């Protein structure tokens, strides 16, 4: 989501 | 002047690793549940609506990595300060990060807004078909400061062992986003932009909670005030030493997934459909790891503050164990219930099983190179967590995939072996830093 990392990880 | 989270942090490292990680893994997971919801609502909107989201993906991930990265530096800096029994320093990192959130946040808004309409045209957007792309990105950038402020507030809390109230923020934000998504998109009939207003409005509420916590209630361990503010050149270097390489790291993990699809597009379109879906399923197992990594940083920082390596090594080594046994269950499930997992993500079923039986096996090796990068940020050396991420995803994961492609099984064979070596390199380098600390 937002907090934290990246993520997504979805489309 | 000592909260519960501080006593966890300043206590048994094994107890600290677990009781901080669980609410983090929860928080990280509940927000992933949102991405699946917003993922299925937007899908039905049509082909034209998904084209605005996918174009607004780099700018979102770009300002998520920044906000989160700044929060990691905040979390690590406060954790190290509290470990050294330095309240005056810990209180002063909290204020320093709050000003940085204002600077970083608003700058993202005022820099990107006038450049968002050229971004689409540069990519080759029509002007009417992707006229939603500017409208979607306009709403998000209008709260790009709130995103950062939320992350910092979250970083401040998990930096003092307050992962419980940090979890609350992750749940309240994802929950409101979840309930406002169908109302804004469908009921109010705003379409794709309604999903942006849902995300915007939900983050406003989270900040209201965050602000109420550390500005109004002030029931947090640290003291936040400007009355005798001392602009530090050292605290600024501290937060950025972890923060800036953290931002690049979170980008590099996804900026390499593009090259993996390129090696899937070259070996074509039917292969990319298999790779992308199999990747999305397997990458779900990273969410529990991320919580452990967030907890590892907090505890290896407090141990670095207390200046004892035996605690720093224990927490970091315990972190790998739990993350190993968590992935052990996850991998087995995906491999055993592969056709069942495929059915839900495929509405190429055969080629997906061939991936979900071999590809997810690299999830077991991951925690070694991940907890190391976590504690690397814990001690304050983010530049090493960055170069280990560059080595893993971009150098090994991609490099092996190209070495095997020059069929489709060579793609998963490259990712696994590449991540297998990186875990071996990462664990050894993590061990070397420990011995270097024991000799210091
Ligand atoms: C403060 C909330 C930030 C909103 C960011 C978008 C600014 C768009 C401005 C008007 C366009 C009218 C269509 C959009 C409807 C505006 C609803 C508020
Ligand atoms: C499309 C239908 C599904 C969503 C229905 C309306 C949201 C609830 C409206 C708020 C009701 C307040 C009582
Ligand atoms: C002594 C006064 C207390 C110390 C203040 C120093 C920190 C200021 C940093 C930005 C705050 C911005 C407030 C954000 C509110 C978000 C509401 C939505």
Automatic annotation (TrEMBL), chain B:
TM helices/strands, residue ranges: 17-37, 49-72, 93-116, 136-157, 169-189, 195-215, 279-304, 316-338, 352-374, 386-406, 410-429
One family name in Pfam for this protein: MatE
GO cellular component, as recorded: plasma membrane
Compartment annotation: Cell membrane
Membrane topology: Multi-pass membrane protein
Primary subcellular site in the record, as a coarse category: membrane
InterPro entries: MATE_fam, MdtK-like, Membrane_Transporter-Flippase
Keyword Translocase: no
Keywords: Cell membrane, Membrane, Transmembrane, Transmembrane helix, Transport
GO molecular function terms noted in the UniProt entry: antiporter activity; xenobiotic transmembrane transporter activity
Name of the molecule in the record: MATE family efflux transporter
The organism of origin for this protein: Pyrococcus furiosus (strain ATCC 43587 / DSM 3638 / JCM 8422 / Vc1)
Lineage of the species this protein comes from: Archaea, Methanobacteriati, Methanobacteriota, Thermococci, Thermococcales
